């Protein structure tokens, strides 16, 4: 019974003995075994009563459960509540993850599950290393558990120990003669995770065991990984590997100076200049076998600079801050390439800094470059398109002109990324289909914000034609949200979410300009959602008919002139006149209705429930369907 299961879960949550003893006796065998071997669903998550016993440090209740019964720890449950909450894990997994040693040792003493393999084949040693307790790890390995359990994405416990700040766990793991050259799915071998959080002692521990330097999948050494994240101390330690070479040393120093220029946590422009100057001096130190810079061609996004191939020009850009920011961006682009994961974020941060200082055009250039790089890498840019929608709505609210080619470029990027989001939704069945669905809906909303911005900006005929071409291209994919809303419906709806940032000032739905633009670009004016409501069924339900009657009037004129049916019914057989719920919308629609005998006859057919299948033209079966 689920009720008595909840009762014994509540009894074991408080760590009591007599309550559970009274609540787990005077029954048969099978029901008691089911009670001790089934999970209770609390807070939307299923968990064993042993899970809540071990999580609160109540080891006495589970110890006496093991004494009085033969309860096992092999029950399937969640992993941890800190943003993972995936099932498949055993009770000993979260017992190790709860940071309680005595419950772990008593669960090992009766039916050890040290070699548990979940859907991620994560042993309880994984959670023990994540928590960072030496005793649990020591005992669990002493229980004859293999430490070389590689995941499907090859996440050794040493990797998660190196990523975290728990140096005791990783030093004990390397004291057991573990593999230091552990390859991962992305190629990151231990040191790449260690020198990413700036853990100097862990990196020293692995260099002592000679973890070796090897390039990962993304073309980044552990030294370049360290220099990418502004962590100077691990860069120092990795630059003394006794095999480092000049080219790697200077590129690491240049990367460190680059990373210090554009970062939120570590922003020092004096460190940027000093590390760039140190790398340049160490470049031009000898005059023989000199290492000149292989300068990339200039990029319009970072102004028009061409790096700094001489110490004199680096000296001249010492006190000029934005030149140093651009210089750091360009040398970071050179070192990490145009196809790395982390090369795009500092560009976005510099764009955000430029936008906060009301310098908008260079902000747009930088963010467009970041968008182009992220789309070449085929990455989720639904946050970047929203960022464009926010900054474009910040210039319009500030009465600043928006460049038409910039709007065209971001609209083309939005259309392409909505295409790839549709492909992502189609390909992924149920792995992360909710996240992809939310990204798809957010991308549709950001496209609508960009179109609304494009309506309020004066453009040339060619640029307006290109914008209309992009909108046309998106329309002829028929993008639909969860509840069947096409791209026209959301521009018609009043419940369409507008982002709480500066987009509220410029983007207001319903919008008569967006609807007119979509209908001119060929939107299906008679398209229906999942509920059957067309574009006209949603505009009539608008609850502010008089405050923006100028908006409400023009959109109904545009919808009817585009060819909407002023009579068709949804799944509930409700004409928009009946679904008008407003006198003003009803008057406007009755003014705009054009009467037809076909509509009246089909309405009479539908009202009288006359069998029309195989008695009418096939093209007229649909007409009976909505009329």
């Amino acid at each position: 019974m689920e009720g008595l299961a909840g009762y014994v879960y509540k009894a074991a949550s408080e760590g009591k003995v007599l309550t559970l003893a009274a609540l787990l006796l005077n029954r048969s065998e099978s029901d008691i075994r089911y009670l001790l071997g089934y999970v209770s669903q609390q807070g939307g998550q299923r968990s064993t009563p042993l899970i809540i016993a071990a999580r609160n440090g109540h080891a006495k209740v589970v110890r006496l459960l093991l004494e009085h019964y033969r309860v096992q720890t092999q029950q399937t449950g969640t992993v941890r509540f800190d943003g993972y909450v995936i099932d498949g894990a055993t009770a000993l997994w979260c017992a190790a993850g709860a940071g309680h040693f005595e419950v772990v040792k008593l669960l090992v003493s009766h039916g050890a599950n040290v070699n548990h393999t979940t859907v991620t084949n994560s042993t309880p040693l994984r959670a023990a290393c994540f928590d960072g307790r030496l005793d649990i790890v020591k005992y669990l390995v002493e229980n004859n558990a293999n430490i070389s359990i590689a995941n499907k994405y090859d996440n050794t416990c040493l990797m998660i120990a190196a990523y975290k700040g728990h140096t005791d766990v990783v030093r004990y793991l390397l004291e057991q003669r573990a593999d230091p050259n552990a390859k991962a799915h992305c190629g990151a071998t231990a040191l790449h995770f260690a020198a990413e959080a700036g853990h100097i002692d862990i990196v020293k521990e692995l260099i002592k065991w000679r973890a070796a330097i090897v390039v990962n999948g993304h073309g980044m050494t552990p030294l370049k990984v360290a220099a990418e994240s502004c962590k100077a101390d691990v860069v120092e330690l990795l630059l003394s590997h006794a095999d480092c070479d000049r080219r790697s040393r200077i590129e690491a120093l240049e990367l460190l100076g680059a990373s210090f220029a554009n970062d939120r946590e570590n922003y020092d422009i004096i460190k940027t200049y000093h590390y760039l100057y140190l790398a340049m001096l160490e470049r031009f130190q000898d005059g023989d076998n000199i290492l000149e810079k292989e300068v990339l061609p200039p990029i319009h996004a970072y102004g028009n600079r061409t790096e700094c191939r001489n110490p004199q020009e680096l000296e001249s850009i010492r006190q000029d801050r934005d030149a140093l920011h651009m210089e750091g961006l360009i040398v970071r682009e050179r070192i990490l390439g145009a196809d790395n994961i982390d090369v795009s974020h500092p560009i976005i941060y510099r764009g955000a800094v430029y936008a906060d200082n009301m310098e908008f055009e260079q902000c747009i250039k930088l963010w467009l470059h970041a968008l182009h790089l992220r789309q070449k890498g085929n990455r989720n840019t639904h946050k970047d398109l929203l960022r464009f929608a926010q900054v474009f709505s910040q210039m319009i609210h500030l009465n600043e002109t928006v460049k038409a080619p910039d709007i065209e470029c971001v609209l083309r990027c939005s259309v392409l990324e909505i295409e790839q989001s549709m492909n992502r939704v189609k390909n992924i069945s149920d792995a992360d289909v909710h996240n992809a669905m939310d990204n798809y809906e957010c991308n549709l909303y950001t496209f609508l914000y960009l179109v609304c911005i494009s309506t309020k900006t004066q453009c040339s005929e060619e640029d307006q034609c290109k914008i209309n071409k992009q909108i046309y291209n998106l329309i002829h994919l028929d993008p639909r949200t969860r509840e069947g809303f096409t791209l026209l419906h959301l521009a018609v709806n009043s419940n369409t979410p507008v982002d709480d940032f500066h987009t509220n000032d410029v983007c207001s739905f319903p919008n008569a300009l967006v609807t007119k633009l979509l209908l001119d670009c060929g939107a299906e004016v008679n398209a229906v959602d999942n509920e059957g409501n067309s574009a006209l069924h949603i505009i009539v339900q608008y609850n502010r008919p008089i405050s923006d009657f100028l908006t409400l009037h023009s959109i109904i004129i545009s919808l009817v002139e585009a060819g909407a049916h002023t009579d068709m019914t949804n799944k509930q057989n409700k004409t928009p006149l009946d679904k008008s719920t407003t006198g003003v919308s009803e008057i406007l629609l009755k003014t705009q209705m054009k009467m037809s005998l076909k509509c009246l006859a089909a309405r009479a057919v539908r009202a009288n429930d006359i069998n029309y299948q195989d008695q009418i033209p096939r093209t007229l079966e649909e007409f009976v369907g909505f009329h």
């Binding site: 998660i160 992305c186 974020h345 764009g351 955000a352 906060d356």
Partner: peptide
């Protein structure tokens, strides 16, 4: 509202 402060492998950082 301060674009810079608004800014901000997930399956691999799982234990």
């Amino acid at each position: 509202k301060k674009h810079s402060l608004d800014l901000l492998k997930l399956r691999h950082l799982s234990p």
